[PDB]
């Protein structure tokens, strides 16, 4: 049983961290993506909600 | 002007400065930054102007001033509806057992005035707590404010688990309310109701001592509202709609110690025992939101099962008396009795249940009224037990049955009765059917008896299980029947 | 005018896109007082924070991405 | 009138209203809510420049600055005359039960008003037999004036004034009021609800003579403070015209703690254990309004609930002095059993007078007295050495005080819930018998045990040769 | 070493890390528009891991 | 960063800083002091534009205001890591002792850690085996769970603390940590140096096993009030590595005055007893992070001071609400040569059941209390009346409980050196099985003696043998 939960919990901190580079790699991707198609297209969405 | 900053942080309280257009009981957000990826979240509670003091949900470190703070539109709310059920969260409804994030479809606001008086009913259906001597002695009725008053390592904890252990397949939605526990009790607790399978509609919410005081005064009330959707609305438990929900609020006096912190840090003025000059009306409106509802308003009710917590036994302090007031009935765990091996230790002679005893069983009551009156004889002759070969025989048969009975009521942990095995067992204990049972066997006399009606008589059980609505329980078939199972197992004994 | 503002945006922008943000924001008062920050962090959006409202347009969609999967 | 809501603290609403046009001190300010249900608040203080502070006597949890408060203009009223007999009410009159509102052409009358002056104050009263051994000896409920009973959490002052009820609101000779000021919604009301509407009185049940104002505990504190004001202006009609009133208030502790409560948040400066400043002064203008006038009699009798069992409490304190007839339920009394838990020694009243209530009631009263005031003498005695050292006279003073402590106790019609002990109705006359003649030295040979929750004297020899 | 092993198999760009980022982009920052105009660049080269 | 001091009242002080980075809640701002030593005040409110409010945890007598304030920008660094054994240290995790710093390599962690979560929690309680037959029998330890002991200092508790600290480190793990909470300088602080130094196992002192937290008497409220948050980050780095740790805190008491003070000193108003509001607050801040967890169990003996000898005192009641097991010291008994001089009667602890300890466990504790208790209510009888007076089939009962109180003696390998006898470690098991032999009637022909200062009852009897 001991074996089992050091495992799950290596496990379960594995995921976290891959989930939390996965976050960051989409994010910076997201980035670069909208500059080179224009920072200056969501601004007219923004201010329909507004 | 749902955005505001923090201008000052303090004794577990910020000051929210311009964020107009908030009412007076709104979570706001504290929406995350950098170096805190969750979101804590505070009540809004002194709306003054130009400035909102705001009671932190959480610890208070972890905001500093400039802190942006939103305002979420929604007075204070918890979580509510059957995806609750099983589930161990925090007092703003955020899951802690790690198992997933809480489903649900509507919240109810917590803090809400209660139904009223013409949105009552009597109580008539009883709650069976699994302990014989509760179960006969203190009638315990759906939508009752039964309180359990104890003095330290006593028992009132493993009588909430015992009672919500029986409620297996009487289709309650039991809820248990850690209030100031520490985590070690807490998820014992849990642990406990996970292996006898009560988890599976049993709801905790746990607030811990090492968490912040504005928890620990919102954890009663999340329960209540959990408690008051099932009243209202009900939830499906195995395969049935069930209105009928019981509370444990556990440690009330440690939530009266959680809201004097959080009414000394805001400065207010202290009252008896430093206790603020509101703390009855505190656990008033905490509990009686748990009410018997009538028919026209959906027929539901809702237990409540408070803890207290004394000192020395002084049932005469401030919290005690005002939980007593607000009850129905008082469940006294003396200490001597715990300590001279009575564990389930019940002060008879001064507990006692106001309302429910017309809601139990009418088998329970017709065979506990004499148990009780043999009770008080006993009690009455405790005075001439040290007098030795200087009592005629009837008080020492008198003492001798006393005796008998206390020991039949000592009822180990973790083991709840049935209804049909207790008014069986006391049949049997009240019509000198156990005279010749000595002492200190009557326990594995009363284990070996409930083994075999479960192994030899499952007939027997379900008759009187059948037959014990009716207005006089001793019919010849149920007497005649349960007679010779126990002369049955005399001579097999 | 009578409010400030506190509009922020995913990048640096140019003289003419603060004239456009400026002259956009019609509805409260026209021309309010702005303050403009760059904060690289935000991404595919704008936060404007006109009078006492704010409008969150950036960096939230990834946000509230971590609360799903985790 | 169109004033702003400028701080919500609590209960306590701040409003900001035109320099012309500021609310009176009791004025009656109300938020609209929306939902076409408006909150109605009470002023309590004007602050300066059109600026009020008001109780909320509501929710007031999910209402925000800047809300537009409406300035009726007159302080809260409510409806009285034969209309409100038979109904449940508001602190604000409205109606609770499923009937219909009350009509307009009923009239409104201001809960604040002035009480009788000292010309209208009516001196005159007499005995008023309930049927309660310990009540009716010790302590007699007296007939047109205040009385209430003093019991701390434990004690079942709930019980006792259930039972009064039950004994004395079927000969009422006139309407009744009850005002739960402070109290369980379960026992103190829908339950009362239950017993008035089971008894009957040639055709016309106990509740249709009587008035039913409530503000239960979960209510905040503005309504538990203004209930009894209501149930009074409620009764004071009544009074006016002449019919004979039952007044039943219960735990006026709770009108008082709410008063605290509202003081807290309102900023005044706390006094003694976080009271009030002005106790004294709430408690007048609510108690001095009970009064029977030369115009007609109200019956009064309150209930107090005495925090932990400090008797030395302010809020008792202050009742103890505005009382005809003063009745002390103790906690060891109860954990002894006695259900009634009354101390005959520290209850009194003012009507155990021989030229008001009998030569021989007051003789054996005084003589129940002297006894029990010698065992509160003996008790260290006894409970250090033992009975043995006392001398014969004395012995024989503590088994009768013993004998007189337990023939207190009598079986009520409403504790068959949970005790199967039939209830029992003492006359007066029977009580005073019964404990002259167990004075007299009858009964000396009967067990202490005998005399527990018996009726009068000839019960307890019925018992007694029915043991042999 | 087993779970070293299977986190390292799934820090490959193309096993999860490229799958993931997409996915997101395709739901979070816009509908169906994750490539829109260029971001050829970080397809599966910039997530690398 | 870089604040300037405002207002210094008392050990209360006020830092203004810019409008941004404004130090957090217990952020342990640091203000130099014109050389290379500095003040470390920790930060507590946040008030206004820029001022924190903060207690100086030092001697403040030199400062002045305006003067440079830096900002750590976290809680207070303690360092942890082996490097921590056998160093003494203050709250600040500086060494107090002879040795030199600890150095940069060393990992700093911040004081105020939280807790371990719900799901960390252990579901069940599992005994912890001290060794010493009546602390393991009458009042039995349980691994993750507070324990206090009650003793007025000249009853060997140094000396039971320094036998726990030896079978934990022979038979275990073995790291303990001692937290010095209002610890005298003189009689708290270089004595148990000499006794840890001098007290040798297996060729290691009990010193060189074990890491010392002093906040002495001497420090301001904020040391004192945060001495046991750095030995718990002490212990916590340990218990992350799996390993079992014993923590010791001395007079947890003076933990809440020193809360109560710091209170006062911030102007918070005064609860019941004039403590501070944040009693159950402060209180599950600690003794909450002394937990049994999946990785690791820190099991803490916490000395309790009562007082007034109130018990319901809130200080002894909230230290009460979060304990497990309780051990009296009693001066009579220790009067009398018996070191181990624990009253079997005060003593209780809660894992004393038989869903836990056992059945056997149990039902020969119970008669061992049964027993005594009737020893107890007979010496009266034998003070007045005397032995002769006293019945059958009690005479042998007092003679049993004569011989049982005897037997609770037990040698300690620690101190072998001063009695010249080797310490013996007895399990639980056979604690349990030798007193029900003891008790079932084996042994009674043996007088008193041959039970003093003995082990099991195999020993005693190998002992009469002899
Ligand atoms: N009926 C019982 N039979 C045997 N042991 C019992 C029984 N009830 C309780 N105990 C034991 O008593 C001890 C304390 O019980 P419990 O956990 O219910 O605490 P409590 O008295 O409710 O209060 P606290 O939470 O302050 O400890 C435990 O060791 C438990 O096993
Ligand atoms: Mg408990």
Same mark, same amino acid.
């Given at each position: 049983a001991?074996?089992?939960?050091?495992?799950?919990?290596?496990?379960?901190?594995?995921?976290?961290?891959?989930?939390?580079?996965?976050?960051?790699?989409?994010?910076?991707?997201?980035?670069?993506?909208?500059?080179?198609?224009?920072?200056?297209?969501?601004?007219a969405?923004?201010?329909?909600?507004? | 002007?749902?955005?505001?900053?923090?201008?000052?942080?303090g004794?577990?309280?910020?000051?929210?400065?311009?964020?107009?257009?908030?009412?007076a009981?709104?979570?706001?957000?504290?929406?995350?930054?950098?170096?805190?990826?969750?979101s804590?979240?505070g009540?809004?509670?002194?709306?003054?102007?130009?400035?909102?003091?705001?009671?932190?949900?959480?610890?208070?470190?972890?905001?500093?001033?400039?802190?942006?703070?939103?305002?979420?539109?929604?007075?204070?709310?918890?979580?509510?509806?059957?995806?609750?059920?099983?589930?161990?969260?925090?007092?703003?409804?955020?899951?802690?057992?790690?198992k997933?994030?809480?489903?649900?479809?509507?919240?109810?606001?917590?803090?809400?005035?209660?139904?009223?008086?013409?949105?009552?009913?009597?109580?008539?259906?009883?709650?069976?707590?699994?302990?014989?001597?509760?179960?006969?002695?203190?009638?315990?009725?759906?939508?009752?404010?039964?309180?359990?008053?104890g003095?330290?390592?006593?028992?009132?904890?493993?009588?909430?688990?015992?009672?919500?252990?029986?409620?297996?397949?009487?289709?309650?939605?039991?809820?248990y309310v850690?209030?100031?526990?520490?985590?070690?009790?807490?998820?014992?607790?849990?642990?406990?109701?996970?292996?006898?399978?009560?988890?599976?509609?049993?709801?905790?919410?746990?607030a811990?001592?090492?968490?912040?005081?504005?928890?620990?005064?919102?954890?009663?009330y999340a329960?209540?509202?959990?408690?008051?959707?099932?009243?209202?609305?009900?939830?499906?438990?195995?395969?049935?709609?069930?209105?009928?929900?019981?509370?444990?609020?556990?440690?009330?006096?440690?939530?009266?110690?959680?809201?004097?912190?959080?009414?000394?840090?805001?400065?207010?003025?202290?009252?008896?025992?430093?206790?603020?000059?509101?703390?009855?009306?505190?656990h008033?409106?905490?509990?009686?939101?748990?009410?018997?509802?009538?028919?026209?308003?959906?027929?539901?009710?809702?237990?409540?099962?408070?803890?207290?917590?004394?000192?020395?036994?002084?049932?005469?302090?401030?919290?005690?008396?005002?939980?007593?007031?607000?009850?129905?009935?008082?469940?006294?765990?003396?200490?001597?009795?715990?300590?001279?091996?009575?564990?389930?230790?019940?002060?008879?002679?001064?507990?006692?249940?106001?309302?429910?005893?017309?809601?139990?069983?009418?088998?329970?009551?017709?065979?506990?009224?004499?148990?009780?009156?043999?009770?008080?004889?006993?009690?009455?002759?405790?005075?001439?037990?040290?007098?030795?070969?200087?009592?005629?025989?009837?008080?020492?048969?008198?003492?001798?049955?006393?005796?008998?009975?206390?020991?039949?009521?000592?009822?180990?942990?973790?083991?709840?009765?049935?209804?049909?095995?207790?008014?069986?067992?006391?049949?049997?204990?009240?019509?000198?059917?156990?005279?010749?049972?000595?002492?200190?066997?009557?326990?594995?006399?009363?284990?070996?008896?409930?083994?075999?009606?479960?192994?030899?008589?499952?007939?027997?059980?379900?008759?009187?299980?059948?037959?014990?609505?009716?207005?006089?329980?001793?019919?010849?078939?149920?007497?005649?029947?349960?007679?010779?199972?126990?002369?049955?197992?005399?001579?097999?004994? | 005018?009578?409010?400030?503002?506190?509009?922020?945006?995913?990048?640096?922008?140019?003289?003419?896109?603060?004239?456009?943000?400026?002259?956009e924001?019609?509805?409260?008062?026209?021309?309010?007082?702005?303050?403009?920050?760059?904060?690289?962090?935000?991404?595919?959006?704008?936060?404007?924070?006109?009078?006492?409202?704010?409008?969150?347009?950036?960096?939230?969609?990834?946000?509230?991405?971590?609360?799903?999967?985790? | 009138?169109?004033?702003?809501?400028?701080?919500?603290?609590?209960?306590?609403?701040r409003?900001?209203?035109?320099?012309?046009?500021?609310?009176?001190?009791?004025?009656?300010?109300?938020?609209?809510?929306?939902?076409?249900?408006?909150?109605?608040?009470?002023?309590?203080?004007?602050?300066?420049?059109?600026?009020?502070?008001?109780?909320?006597?509501?929710?007031?949890?999910?209402?925000?600055?800047?809300?537009?408060?409406?300035?009726? +203009?007159?302080?809260?009223? =409510?409806?009285?005359?034969?209309? !409100?007999?038979?109904?449940? #009410?508001?602190?604000? %009159?409205?109606? $609770?039960?499923?009937?219909?509102?009350?009509?307009?052409?009923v009239?409104?009358?201001?809960?604040?008003?002035?009480?009788?002056?000292?010309?209208?104050?009516?001196?005159?009263?007499?005995?008023?037999?309930?049927?309660?051994?310990?009540?009716?000896?010790?302590?007699?409920?007296?007939?047109?004036?205040?009385?209430?009973?003093?019991?701390?959490?434990?004690?079942?002052?709930?019980?006792?004034?259930?039972?009064?009820?039950?004994?004395?609101?079927?000969?009422?000779?006139?309407?009744?009021?009850?005002?739960?000021?402070?109290?369980?919604?379960?026992?103190?009301?829908?339950?009362?609800?239950?017993?008035?509407?089971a008894?009957?009185?040639?055709?016309?049940?106990?509740?249709?003579?009587?008035?039913?104002?409530?503000?239960?505990?979960?209510?905040?504190? +503005?309504?538990?403070?203004? =209930?009894?004001?209501?149930?009074? !202006?409620?009764?004071?009609? #009544?009074?006016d015209? %002449?019919?004979? $009133?039952?007044?039943?208030?219960?735990?006026?502790?709770?009108?008082?703690?709410?008063?605290?409560?509202?003081?807290?948040?309102?900023?005044?400066?706390?006094?003694?254990?976080?009271?009030?400043?002005?106790l004294?002064?709430?408690?007048?203008?609510?108690?001095?309004?009970?009064?029977?006038?030369?115009?007609?009699?109200?019956t009064?009798?309150?209930?107090?609930?005495?925090?932990?069992?400090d008797?030395?409490?302010?809020?008792?304190?202050?009742?103890?002095?505005?009382?005809?007839?003063?009745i002390?339920?103790?906690?060891?009394?109860?954990?002894?059993?006695?259900?009634?838990?009354?101390?005959?020694?520290?209850?009194?009243?003012?009507?155990?007078?021989?030229?008001?209530?009998?030569?021989?009631?007051?003789?054996?009263?005084?003589?129940?007295?002297?006894?029990?005031?010698?065992?509160?003498?003996?008790?260290?005695?006894?409970?250090?050495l033992?009975?043995?050292?006392?001398?014969?006279?004395d012995?024989?003073?503590?088994?009768?005080?013993?004998?007189?402590?337990?023939?207190?106790?009598?079986?009520?019609?409403?504790?068959?819930?949970?005790?199967?002990?039939?209830?029992?109705?003492?006359?007066?006359?029977?009580?005073?018998?019964?404990?002259?003649?167990?004075?007299?030295?009858?009964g000396?040979?009967?067990?202490?045990?005998?005399?527990?929750?018996?009726?009068?004297?000839?019960?307890?020899?019925?018992?007694?040769?029915?043991?042999?």
């Amino acid at each position: 049983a001991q074996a089992e939960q050091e495992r799950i919990r290596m496990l379960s901190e594995a995921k976290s961290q891959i989930a939390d580079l996965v976050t960051l790699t989409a994010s910076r991707v997201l980035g670069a993506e909208l500059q080179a198609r224009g920072h200056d297209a969501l601004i007219a969405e923004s201010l329909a909600a507004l | 002007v749902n955005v505001g900053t923090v201008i000052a942080v303090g004794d577990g309280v910020a000051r929210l400065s311009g964020l107009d257009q908030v009412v007076a009981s709104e979570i706001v957000e504290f929406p995350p930054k950098a170096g805190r990826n969750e979101s804590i979240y505070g009540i809004a509670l002194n709306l003054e102007q130009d400035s909102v003091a705001a009671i932190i949900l959480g610890d208070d470190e972890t905001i500093e001033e400039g802190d942006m703070v939103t305002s979420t539109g929604r007075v204070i709310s918890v979580p509510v509806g059957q995806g609750l059920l099983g589930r161990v969260v925090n007092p703003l409804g955020q899951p802690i057992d790690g198992k997933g994030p809480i489903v649900y479809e509507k919240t109810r606001p917590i803090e809400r005035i209660a139904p009223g008086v013409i949105t009552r009913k009597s109580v008539d259906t009883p709650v069976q707590t699994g302990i014989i001597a509760i179960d006969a002695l203190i009638p315990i009725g759906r939508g009752q404010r039964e309180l359990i008053i104890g003095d330290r390592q006593t028992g009132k904890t493993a009588v909430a688990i015992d009672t919500i252990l029986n409620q297996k397949g009487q289709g309650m939605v039991c809820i248990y309310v850690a209030i100031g526990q520490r985590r070690a009790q807490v998820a014992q607790v849990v642990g406990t109701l996970e292996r006898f399978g009560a988890m599976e509609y049993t709801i905790v919410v746990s607030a811990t001592a090492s968490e912040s005081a504005a928890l620990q005064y919102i954890a009663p009330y999340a329960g209540c509202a959990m408690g008051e959707e099932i009243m209202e609305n009900g939830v499906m438990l195995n395969g049935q709609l069930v209105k009928d929900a019981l509370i444990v609020y556990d440690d009330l006096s440690k939530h009266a110690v959680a809201y004097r912190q959080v009414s000394l840090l805001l400065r207010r003025p202290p009252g008896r025992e430093a206790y603020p000059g509101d703390v009855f009306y505190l656990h008033s409106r905490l509990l009686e939101r748990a009410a018997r509802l009538n028919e026209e308003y959906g027929g539901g009710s809702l237990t409540a099962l408070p803890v207290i917590e004394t000192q020395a036994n002084d049932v005469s302090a401030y919290i005690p008396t005002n939980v007593i007031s607000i009850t129905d009935g008082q469940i006294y765990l003396e200490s001597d009795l715990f300590n001279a091996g009575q564990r389930p230790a019940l002060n008879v002679g001064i507990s006692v249940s106001r309302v429910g005893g017309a809601a139990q069983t009418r088998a329970m009551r017709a065979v506990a009224g004499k148990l009780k009156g043999e009770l008080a004889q006993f009690r009455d002759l405790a005075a001439f037990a040290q007098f030795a070969s200087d009592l005629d025989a009837t008080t020492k048969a008198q003492i001798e049955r006393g005796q008998r009975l206390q020991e039949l009521l000592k009822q180990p942990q973790y083991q709840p009765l049935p209804v049909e095995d207790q008014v069986a067992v006391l049949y049997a204990a009240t019509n000198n059917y156990l005279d010749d049972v000595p002492v200190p066997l009557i326990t594995k006399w009363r284990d070996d008896f409930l083994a075999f009606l479960r192994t030899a008589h499952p007939e027997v059980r379900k008759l009187i299980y059948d037959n014990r609505l009716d207005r006089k329980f001793p019919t010849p078939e149920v007497k005649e029947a349960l007679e010779a199972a126990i002369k049955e197992f005399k001579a097999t004994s | 005018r009578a409010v400030d503002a506190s509009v922020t945006s995913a990048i640096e922008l140019s003289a003419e896109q603060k004239e456009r943000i400026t002259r956009e924001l019609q509805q409260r008062y026209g021309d309010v007082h702005v303050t403009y920050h760059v904060d690289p962090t935000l991404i595919g959006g704008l936060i404007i924070r006109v009078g006492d409202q704010v409008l969150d347009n950036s960096l939230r969609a990834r946000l509230s991405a971590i609360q799903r999967v985790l | 009138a169109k004033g702003v809501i400028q701080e919500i603290i609590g209960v306590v609403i701040r409003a900001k209203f035109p320099e012309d046009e500021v609310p009176e001190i009791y004025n009656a300010i109300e938020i609209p809510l929306g939902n076409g249900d408006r909150l109605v608040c009470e002023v309590q203080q004007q602050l300066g420049n059109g600026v009020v502070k008001a109780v909320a006597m509501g929710s007031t949890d999910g209402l925000r600055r800047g809300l537009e408060v409406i300035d009726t +203009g007159r302080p809260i009223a =409510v409806p009285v005359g034969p209309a !409100t007999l038979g109904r449940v #009410f508001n602190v604000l %009159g409205d109606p $609770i039960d499923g009937m219909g509102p009350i009509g307009p052409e009923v009239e409104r009358r201001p809960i604040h008003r002035d009480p009788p002056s000292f010309e209208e104050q009516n001196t005159q009263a007499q005995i008023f037999e309930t049927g309660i051994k310990v009540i009716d000896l010790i302590a007699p409920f007296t007939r047109g004036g205040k009385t209430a009973i003093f019991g701390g959490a434990g004690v079942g002052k709930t019980v006792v004034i259930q039972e009064l009820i039950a004994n004395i609101a079927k000969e009422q000779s006139g309407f009744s009021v009850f005002a739960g000021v402070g109290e369980r919604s379960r026992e103190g009301n829908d339950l009362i609800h239950e017993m008035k509407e089971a008894r009957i009185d040639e055709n016309t049940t106990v509740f249709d003579k009587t008035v039913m104002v409530f503000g239960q505990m979960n209510e905040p504190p +503005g309504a538990r403070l203004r =209930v009894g004001l209501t149930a009074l !202006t409620m009764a004071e009609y #009544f009074r006016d015209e %002449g019919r004979d $009133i039952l007044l039943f208030i219960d735990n006026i502790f709770r009108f008082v703690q709410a008063g605290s409560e509202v003081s807290s948040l309102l900023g005044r400066m706390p006094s003694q254990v976080g009271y009030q400043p002005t106790l004294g002064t709430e408690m007048g203008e609510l108690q001095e309004r009970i009064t029977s006038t030369k115009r007609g009699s109200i019956t009064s009798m309150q209930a107090v609930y005495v925090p932990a069992d400090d008797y030395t409490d302010p809020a008792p304190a202050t009742v103890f002095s505005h009382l005809d007839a003063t009745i002390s339920l103790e906690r060891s009394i109860a954990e002894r059993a006695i259900f009634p838990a009354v101390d005959p020694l520290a209850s009194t009243s003012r009507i155990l007078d021989p030229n008001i209530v009998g030569e021989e009631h007051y003789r054996v009263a005084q003589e129940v007295k002297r006894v029990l005031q010698r065992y509160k003498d003996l008790k260290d005695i006894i409970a250090i050495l033992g009975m043995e050292e006392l001398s014969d006279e004395d012995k024989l003073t503590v088994q009768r005080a013993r004998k007189i402590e337990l023939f207190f106790s009598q079986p009520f019609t409403v504790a068959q819930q949970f005790t199967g002990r039939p209830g029992k109705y003492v006359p007066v006359k029977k009580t005073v018998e019964s404990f002259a003649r167990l004075l007299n030295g009858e009964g000396d040979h009967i067990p202490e045990s005998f005399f527990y929750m018996q009726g009068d004297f000839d019960d307890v020899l019925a018992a007694y040769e029915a043991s042999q």
